Amino acid sequence: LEQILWRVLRGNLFFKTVEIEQPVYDVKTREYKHKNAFIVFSHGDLIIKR
Amino acid sequence: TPNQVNDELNKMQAFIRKEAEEKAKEIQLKADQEYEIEKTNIVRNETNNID
Amino acid sequence: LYTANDFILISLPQNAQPVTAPGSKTDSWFNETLIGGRAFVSDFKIPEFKIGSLDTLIVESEELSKVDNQIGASIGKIIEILQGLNETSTNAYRTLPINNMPVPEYLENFQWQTRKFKLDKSIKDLITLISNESSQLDADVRATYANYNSAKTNLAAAERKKTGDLSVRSLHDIVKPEDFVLNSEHLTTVLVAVPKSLKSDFEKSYETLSKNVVPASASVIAEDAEYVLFNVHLFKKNVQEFTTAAREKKFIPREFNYSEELIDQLKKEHDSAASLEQSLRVQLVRLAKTAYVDVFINWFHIKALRVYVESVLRYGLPPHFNIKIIAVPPKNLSKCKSELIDAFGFEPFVMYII
C-alpha cells in the first residue's frame, strides 16, 4: 500500500503506521491476521478521494 | 533516514503554503476589483437617489 | 553526434549531486558516465511558470501522461503512413527532418512549451490546446489516409477493368461502331461472348441464335485469355436470340454498353483515377512532411508538460529542477538505463522518458 501510494501520489504524503496487538478476523478470508493502522494525511480534496 | 521524511514533509508543507498564498492573493485581487465595482455601483445609486 | 537512434530524457533537482559516483559536479559526472556510454548531453530550458494545486498537479500529470501516450501513438501512425509511400527515410521517419533540420538539431535547444503557443496561460489551458492541436493533426492524417485509400481503390479498379479476359475490355482499346454505339433496335447489332477459342466454335455458338436477327456468324479474335473475345452482331430486337447465341455453347457472354458517351466516360474515369492517385500521393507527402513537425511537436509538448509535472512532484516546492539532454547511441541503450538508475539514488528517478 505504501509503495502504491508513493507511486500514484508521487508527491510527498506522510504515513502513520501503527501495529495492532492481536489479529482480527476477516469476513471473506475467514481468518484473523495481524493488522496495522493506515493513518495518512495529504492536501487536496481530489487527492483525498483518490 | 529521518532526514528524507523530514524533507518530504517540508516539501508538502511548502506546497500547501504556496497554494494557500496563491488562493489568498487571488481572493485579495478579486476583493479589490469587487470593491471598485461596488464603489462605482454605490456612487451611481447615490447620485441617482440624491439628484 | 551519433544521436540518430533513440534518445532517453531525464530530469533531476538542480541542487542534487551524483549518487553512482561521488563526483564533485553533476554535469561533469554525467559527462564522464556519458563518455562510458559514448553519449552527448546538454541542458534544455523548457519551463512553465504557472503552478497549480497538489491535487490539480496530480490530475494534470495523469492527463498529461494519457495525452502524451495518445500523441505518441498518433506520431507513430503518421511515421508509418509516411513510410508507406516510401517517402520517409530510415523506416518510420526516424531521420525525417523537423523544423528544416534533423532531429538532433530540432532537439538541440528545444522549447516545445515556449513561444507564442501557450506563452503564459494555465497548465490546464496548455494541455487543452495541445490536445486540440493533436486532434486536428490526427483528423488531417485520417483524411490523408482515406484519400490515399480511395485513390488506390480507383487505380486498382482502372487496372482491373482493362483486362478483358472475361469481361468488357478498356473502352480505349475497344471499337465503338456495332458495339452498342448506335447498333440499337433494328438499325444495327452488337454482341460479345467467349465461345472456346476458334471461329467455328463461335460459329457453333452463333448457330444457336436461330437467325432471328443479325444472322451474320460471330467472329471472335483477341488476346483475351488466348481465347474467344468477340464484337459480333446480335440485334436488340432479338435479345433473347442474342443471349441464346452464346448461352447454348457456354460462351459466357460479356457484352456491355460501349457507346461514344460511354467510351468517353470510361476514358475520363481512368484519367481521373490516375490523376487522383497522383494528387493524393502528393497531398499525403505534403501532409506527412507537415505532420512530422506538427504531431512531433505536439507529442514533445505533452512530454515536456509531463516532465515539468514530474519535476514539480519530485521537488514539491520551491519549483526548481534541472533537465538533461536525451541523446544516446543505441549501443549504450541498456547501459544508460543502469547508469542513470545508479546515479538516481533517491521510474524512481525524478524524470525519465524514451
| ∠ Cα C218 C265 C166 (to 5°) | 40
Dihedral over Cα of C253, C254, C259, C260: its sign = negative
Q: Is C16 on the interface with B (CB under 8 A)?
A: no
**B23 to chain A, minimum CA–CA distance in Å?**
13
Dihedral over Cα of C21, C22, C27, C28: its sign = negative
Task: Give the CATH number of the domain where residue C242 resides.
Answer: 3.30.70.100
Name the nearest CA neighbour of C175 among C136, C210, C222, C237. Answer: C222
Task: Give the CATH number of the domain where residue C262 resides.
Answer: 1.20.1460.10
Pure H helices in C85-165: 103-106, 123-161
How far apart are the C-alpha atoms of C69 and C76, rounded to whole Å? 11
Question: Does residue C177 share a domain with residue C104?
Answer: no
Experimental technique, in short, is: cryo-EM
Nearest residue on chain A to C314, alpha-carbon basis: A11
Question: Does residue C140 share a domain with residue C79?
Answer: yes
**B32 to chain A, minimum CA–CA distance in Å?**
27
Yes or no, beta carbons of B11 and A12 under 8 Å apart: yes
Q: How many residues are present in chain A? A: 50
For C90: left if phi > 0, alpha if psi spans -120 to 50, otherwise beta; the answer is left
Domain extent, residue C306, equals: 46-167+258-318
Question: Does residue C216 share a domain with residue C132?
Answer: no
Resolution (Å units): 3.8
Could you say which DSSP state residue C230 is in? B
Question: Does residue C305 share a domain with residue C215?
Answer: no
How far apart are the C-alpha atoms of C257 and C244, rounded to whole Å? 19
Q: Where are the beta strands (DSSP E) in chain C?
A: 10-12, 322-324
Nearest by CB to residue A44, choosing from C55, C61, C310, is: C55
Question: Does residue C115 share a domain with residue C182?
Answer: no
**C52 to chain A, minimum CA–CA distance in Å?**
11
For C129: left if phi > 0, alpha if psi spans -120 to 50, otherwise beta; the answer is alpha
Question: Does residue C292 share a domain with residue C342?
Answer: no
Per DSSP, the three-state class of C118 is coil
Task: Give the CATH number of the domain where residue C337 resides.
Answer: 3.30.70.1180
Residue C97's identity, in one-letter code, is P
Task: Give yes or no for a contact between A42 and A9, defined as CB atoms under 8 angstroms apart.
Answer: yes
Residue whose C-alpha cell is 476583493: B31
Dihedral over Cα of C201, C207, C211, C212: its sign = negative
DSSP string, chain B: -HHHHHHHHHHHHHHHHHHHHHHHHHHHHHHHHHHHHHHHHHHHHHHHHH-
Task: Give yes or no for a contact between C202 and C219, defined as CB atoms under 8 angstroms apart.
Answer: yes
Residue B20: exposure state from Cβ atoms within 10 A (0-12, 13-18, ≥19): exposed
Which cell is C270 given? Answer: 481512368
Question: Does residue C65 share a domain with residue C160?
Answer: yes
> What are the CA-CA distances from residue C251 to residues C29, C123, C197, C231 (Å)?
85, 74, 10, 13
Question: Does residue C36 share a domain with residue C121?
Answer: no
Rg (CA), chain A: 14
Task: Give yes or no for a contact between C86 and C16, defined as CB atoms under 8 angstroms apart.
Answer: no
Q: How many CA atoms lie within 13 A of C87 on its CB side?
A: 17
Question: Does residue C71 share a domain with residue C128?
Answer: yes
**B35 to chain C, minimum CA–CA distance in Å?**
26
Count of CB atoms within 10 A of residue C128's CB? 15
Name the nearest CA neighbour of C206 among C237, C236, C246, C235. Answer: C246
First vs last Cα of chain C: how many Å apart?
18
Query: What angle, rounded to 10 degrees, do the helices at C123-161 and C260-315 form?
Result: 150
Q: Is B9 on the interface with C (CB under 8 A)?
A: no
How far apart are the C-alpha atoms of C293 and C300, rounded to whole Å? 10
Question: Does residue C205 share a domain with residue C145?
Answer: no
Distance of CA C131 to the CA centre of its chain: 21
How far apart are the C-alpha atoms of C299 and C130, rounded to whole Å? 8
Task: Give yes or no for a contact between C7 and C328, defined as CB atoms under 8 angstroms apart.
Answer: yes
Task: Give yes or no for a contact between C4 and C14, defined as CB atoms under 8 angstroms apart.
Answer: no
How far apart are the C-alpha atoms of C281 and C145, rounded to whole Å? 10
Cβ-proximal residues to C3 (8 Å cutoff; 6+ apart), any chain: C40, C103, C104, C327, C328, C329
Dihedral over Cα of B20, C351, C104, C132: its sign = negative
Task: Give yes or no for a contact between A27 and A6, defined as CB atoms under 8 angstroms apart.
Answer: no
Could you say which DSSP state residue C240 is in? H
Name the nearest CA neighbour of A41 among A17, A14, A20. Answer: A14
Q: Measure the CA dihedral C183/C180/C172/C251, to 10°.
A: -110
Cβ-proximal residues to C257 (8 Å cutoff; 6+ apart), any chain: C180
Task: Give yes or no for a contact between C17 and C322, defined as CB atoms under 8 angstroms apart.
Answer: no
Q: Count up the domains in chain C and report the number.
A: 3
Yes or no, beta carbons of C61 and A10 under 8 Å apart: yes
Report phi then psi at A36, rounded to 5: -145, 155
Cβ-proximal residues to C168 (8 Å cutoff; 6+ apart), any chain: C161, C174, C192, C254, C255, C256, C258
Report phi then psi at C191, rounded to 5: -155, 155
Yes or no, beta carbons of A14 and B19 under 8 Å apart: no
Name the nearest CA neighbour of C76 among C20, C25, C165, C6. Answer: C6
Residue C219's identity, in one-letter code, is S
Count of CB atoms within 10 A of residue B5's CB? 12
Question: Does residue C304 share a domain with residue C343?
Answer: no
Residue whose C-alpha cell is 460459329: C203
Residue whose C-alpha cell is 454605490: B42
Which cell is C14 given? Answer: 538542480
Q: How many CA atoms lie within 13 A of C103 on its CB side?
A: 20
Task: Give yes or no for a contact between C206 and C197, defined as CB atoms under 8 angstroms apart.
Answer: no
**A40 has which bridge partners?**
A15
Last residue of a domain, one of C231, C257, C283: C257
- Identify the chains in contact with B, defined as 3+ C-beta pairs within 8 A: A, C
Question: Does residue C329 share a domain with residue C228?
Answer: no
Q: Is A42 on the interface with B (CB under 8 A)?
A: yes
Task: Give yes or no for a contact between C345 and C36, defined as CB atoms under 8 angstroms apart.
Answer: no
